[PDB]
């Protein structure tokens, strides 16, 4: 019998000739690989609990290609749908782990590369915005930005990309993949940019949703037959705040929740 | 772009049913769809909504249980099944399209495309 090293599943997406259908198909496939056999609470799938999750089920891979015919593979943690690192050619790069258990988990990613690197910084938006020199509100998203971001990640091993541009490229990828997988609303925002072949920065309603995912997951899972103990404040597109008191309002907005 | 056209309205007695259709041309194209209604001299009000790729639904309290919204991508149509109709349901019903739906999907001002409306009339008393 032959013994093979273990593999994590790969989902493909290309910006080359991307359409509303190809992007929607990609996000649906990512969600499907995140939620196999998952628990569902108030119609919303819950991602696996990090505690007790076997290492051979901890990650999924997103292989991104572009019109330049380059390929980079991002690793997503299935417990929060977030990017933990990427591979380009014969090199892999990882955000600084938050703890020693997560540091051990990432050693199982990209076990065919000859060069492995860990950034001293983590991958949260605050830090990446600092390195990029721009907030999310001033970084345009769309197929154009993603096309360029894939090239920038690829060329980081060759010296053609410096860290600020790399951080900007992560901000683009994370929002167009991780946040779109988490939120039907952000999926639609990205699909509309593709539909019109335009790029534009995310408005305050998108940013606040991103910042609120953990708290929304908590409120839903702690609710009393769908009613929140305390209302959650979100933002409209014009920046004004509004309150949400019930899971039923979040059902069209959210697609996945972190385990609580 | 997208163009929307509603059909399926009519006159029914209390307890009757109607199935409204919101047909998108050339394609529904993963747009979310919201249904609204407006009676003479009253404000428009959102009734129900459905998202474009997961078919997640929302209903105003006044129509929960009685109304069911569903999406048929192959027919490029979003349906609103209306059961146990009441006189108070009399109105022109409109469908609207947005991608994504507004965060509160009864916010009509944020939708981008609208149909022309189909009339629903429910008699005040049973027939005969
Ligand atoms: Cl694939
Ligand atoms: Cl439940
Ligand atoms: Cl986690
Ligand atoms: Cl650590
Ligand atoms: Cl390796
Ligand atoms: Cl800044
Ligand atoms: Cl746009
Ligand atoms: Cl969060
Ligand atoms: Cl607004
Ligand atoms: Cl009025
Ligand atoms: Cl309205």
CATH of the domain at B117: 2.60.40.10
The answer to whether the CB atoms of A252 and B99 lie below 8 A apart is no
Query: How far apart (Å, rounded) are the C-alpha atoms in residues A174 and A74?
Result: 10
Q: Return the domain boundaries, chain A.
A: 3-181, 182-260
Helix-, strand-, coil-residue percentages of chain B, each rounded to 5: 5, 45, 45
Select from B2, B24, B28, B30 the residue whose CB has the most chain A CBs within 10 Å, as the one to mutate to test that interface: B30
Of B82, B105, B99, the C-alpha closest to B18 is B82
Residue B54 lies in a domain: yes
For residue B121, give every residue at least 6 positions away whose Cβ sits within 8 Å of its Cβ, in sequence order, or none.
Answer: B9, B10, B11, B12, B90
How remote is the CA of residue A87 from the centroid of ligand 5, in Å?
10
Measured in angstroms, the resolution is: 1.8
Note the maximum CA span of chain B.
47
Query: How far apart (Å, rounded) are the C-alpha atoms in residues B95 and B31?
Result: 12
Residue of A nearest to B98 (CA): A188
User: Which residue bears the tokens 């909504």?
Assistant: B49
- Whether A210 is catalytic is no
* Residue B30 tokens, joined: 């993963």
Identify whether A54 is preceded by a cis peptide bond (ω within 30 of 0).
no
The total number of structural domains that make up chain B: 1
What domain range is B58 assigned to? 3-122
How remote is the CA of residue A209 from the centroid of ligand 6, in Å?
20
Phi, psi (deg, nearest 5) at residue B64: -55, 145
Has A144 been labeled as part of a binding site?
A: yes
Phi, psi (deg, nearest 5) at residue A3: -105, 120
Residue B78 lies in a domain: yes
Residue B99 lies in a domain: yes
- Whether A260 is catalytic is no
- Taken in order A200, A204, A206, A208, the sign of the CA dihedral is positive
- Whether A125 is catalytic is yes
A237/chain B closest Cα distance in angstroms? 9
Helix (H, G, I), strand (E, B) or coil at A203: coil
User: What was the structure determination method?
Assistant: X-ray
Helix (H, G, I), strand (E, B) or coil at A161: coil
User: Which residue bears the tokens 């009253």?
Assistant: B42
Residue B127 lies in a domain: no
Residue B102 lies in a domain: yes
Helix (H, G, I), strand (E, B) or coil at A208: helix
A188/chain B closest Cα distance in angstroms? 4
Ligand nearest to the CA of A118: 4
């Amino acid at each position: 019998a032959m013994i093979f090293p273990k593999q994590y599943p790969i989902i493909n997406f290309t910006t080359a000739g991307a359409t509303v259908q190809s992007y929607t198909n990609f996000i649906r496939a990512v969600r499907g690989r995140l939620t196999t056999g998952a628990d569902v609470r108030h119609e919303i799938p819950v991602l696996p609990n990090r505690v007790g999750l076997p290492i051979n089920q901890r990650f999924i891979l997103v292989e991104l290609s572009n019109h330049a015919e380059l390929s980079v593979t991002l690793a997503l943690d299935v417990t929060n749908a977030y990017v933990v690192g990427y591979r380009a050619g014969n090199s892999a790069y990882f955000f600084h782990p938050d703890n020693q258990e997560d540091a051990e988990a990432i050693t199982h990613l990209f076990t065919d590369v000859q060069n492995r690197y860990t950034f001293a910084f983590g991958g949260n938006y605050d830090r990446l915005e600092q390195l990029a020199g721009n907030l999310r509100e001033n970084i345009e998203l769309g197929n154009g930005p993603l096309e360029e971001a894939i090239s920038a990640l690829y060329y980081y091993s060759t010296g053609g990309t410096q860290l600020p541009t790399l951080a900007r490229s992560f901000i683009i990828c994370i929002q167009m993949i991780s946040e779109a997988a988490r939120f039907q609303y952000i999926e639609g925002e990205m699909r509309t940019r593709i539909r019109y072949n335009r790029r534009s920065a995310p408005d305050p309603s998108v940013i606040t949703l991103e910042n609120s995912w953990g708290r929304l997951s908590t409120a839903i899972q702690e609710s009393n037959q769908g009613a929140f103990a305390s209302p959650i404040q979100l933002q409209r597109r014009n920046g004004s705040k509004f309150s949400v008191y019930d899971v039923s309002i979040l059902i069209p907005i959210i697609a996945l929740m972190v385990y609580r | 772009q997208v163009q929307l056209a509603e059909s399926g309205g009519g006159l029914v007695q209390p307890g009757g049913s109607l199935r409204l259709s919101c047909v998108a041309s050339p394609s529904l194209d993963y747009y979310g769809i919201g249904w609204f209604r407006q009676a003479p001299g009253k404000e428009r009000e959102g009734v129900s909504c459905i998202t474009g790729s997961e078919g997640s639904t929302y209903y105003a309290d006044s129509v929960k249980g009685r109304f069911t919204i569903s999406r048929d991508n192959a027919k490029n149509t979003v349906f609103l099944q209306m059961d146990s109709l009441k006189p108070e349901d009399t109105a022109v019903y409109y469908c609207a399209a947005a991608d994504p739906l507004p965060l509160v999907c009864t916010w009509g001002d944020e939708y981008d495309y609208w149909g022309q409306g189909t009339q629903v009339t429910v008699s005040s008393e049973p027939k005969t």
